[PDB]
Amino acid sequence: SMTARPLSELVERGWAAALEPVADQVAHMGQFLRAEIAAGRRYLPAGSNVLRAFTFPFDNVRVLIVGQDPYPTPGHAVGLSFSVAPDVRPWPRSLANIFDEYTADLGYPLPSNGDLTPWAQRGVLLLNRVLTVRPSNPASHRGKGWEAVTECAIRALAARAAPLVAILWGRDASTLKPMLAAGNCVAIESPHPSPLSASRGFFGSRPFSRANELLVGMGAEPIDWRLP
Ligand SMILES: O=C1CC(=O)NC(=O)N1
Ligand code: NA
Ligand code: NA
């Protein structure tokens, strides 16, 4: 629980140091969530998964994907942006759109399932700008305190002595672009892959191949995007 336990227990060691400026804020978010349950409102994903993106090593990140907030349907959000458990079917519509673009850009077949853990295990941070949502109500936790947390995460990645490519999907993710100005960092941005915005420029955006051409240009290893 993020109210009760310190960052050294909740997240990977690198991340716990990266997030030290927002340690109090993370504990405040735990109190927010406790107050939501006390009031009779729910949240997603499960408490133990809220900070899951920060359980993969900070030092290993090469690409950041940033979306808006977690899936609104109970059983979808797992604490990694856009990912679902490997037994979820049908896929959420945003994920089906992502995979559409993944096949169009990379030429790979459609993935077997919606589990994006291989990307997280290969240096892709699967972040959302806001880390919780009320069921059925997208953007319901906007402006409740998560933005400081994910701003801190980006600033800290950007400051590392390492290349970084950010893929910013949608309007709320785009508000991280000012914190990527330094020469070691580059941001791709597009409309969000949700059906409400995908046709405004998500489809055709080629984010996966472009991120790899940016990494290679900076002297970093490209991501192996291929899902099973
Ligand atoms: O519905 C969703 C899921 C997610 O993780 N990220 C988003 O921006 N939208
Ligand atoms: Na949106
Ligand atoms: Na957004």
Side-chain angles (χ1 to χ4, degrees):
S1 166
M2 76 189 41
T3 29
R5 292 302 179 116
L7 282 170
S8 54
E9 170 167 355
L10 300 169
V11 301
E12 173 280 327
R13 177 211 32 84
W15 277 109
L19 296 173
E20 186 38 48
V22 292
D24 292 334
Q25 185 71 357
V26 165
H28 173 71
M29 294 316 295
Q31 293 295 161
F32 164 75
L33 297 172
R34 173 178 297 154
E36 287 297 295
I37 299 305
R41 295 186 290 279
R42 304 163 94 148
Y43 68 89
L44 301 168
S48 63
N49 284 333
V50 173
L51 302 176
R52 182 174 178 201
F54 307 133
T55 65
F56 297 85
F58 173 84
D59 303 331
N60 291 2
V61 175
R62 305 203 296 293
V63 176
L64 157 74
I65 295 177
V66 188
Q68 175 179 279
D69 66 335
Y71 289 113
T73 314
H76 286 170
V78 299
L80 296 173
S81 65
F82 303 103
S83 199
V84 293
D87 58 352
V88 162
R89 68 284 195 168
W91 302 337
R93 297 173 184 93
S94 288
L95 189 56
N97 285 353
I98 291 166
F99 288 171
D100 190 295
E101 186 56 28
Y102 162 97
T103 66
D105 183 19
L106 298 172
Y108 298 153
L110 279 172
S112 297
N113 64 41
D115 184 0
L116 304 181
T117 58
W119 295 351
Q121 292 167 347
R122 295 173 188 166
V124 186
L125 180 67
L126 300 175
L127 194 63
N128 281 315
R129 190 77 168 88
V130 165
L131 300 179
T132 55
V133 68
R134 196 168 71 90
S136 294
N137 284 273
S140 41
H141 296 178
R142 187 188 287 134
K144 300 289 194 173
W146 286 119
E147 289 84 347
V149 179
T150 58
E151 177 187 330
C152 181
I154 270 59
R155 216 172 276 291
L157 283 171
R160 299 173 307 154
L164 182 66
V165 176
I167 302 172
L168 304 177
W169 284 338
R171 295 184 49 180
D172 291 359
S174 82
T175 70
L176 295 169
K177 161 108 166 208
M179 300 101 194
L180 295 161
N184 58 310
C185 303
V186 62
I188 284 0
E189 58 179 303
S190 77
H192 192 280
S194 151
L196 302 181
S197 55
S199 300
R200 301 173 184 173
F202 177 81
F203 297 127
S205 63
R206 296 172 299 111
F208 308 106
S209 62
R210 286 166 61 217
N212 279 351
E213 184 173 353
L214 294 164
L215 284 169
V216 164
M218 283 195 282
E221 294 307 330
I223 306 300
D224 180 5
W225 296 110
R226 173 72 175 264
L227 293 164

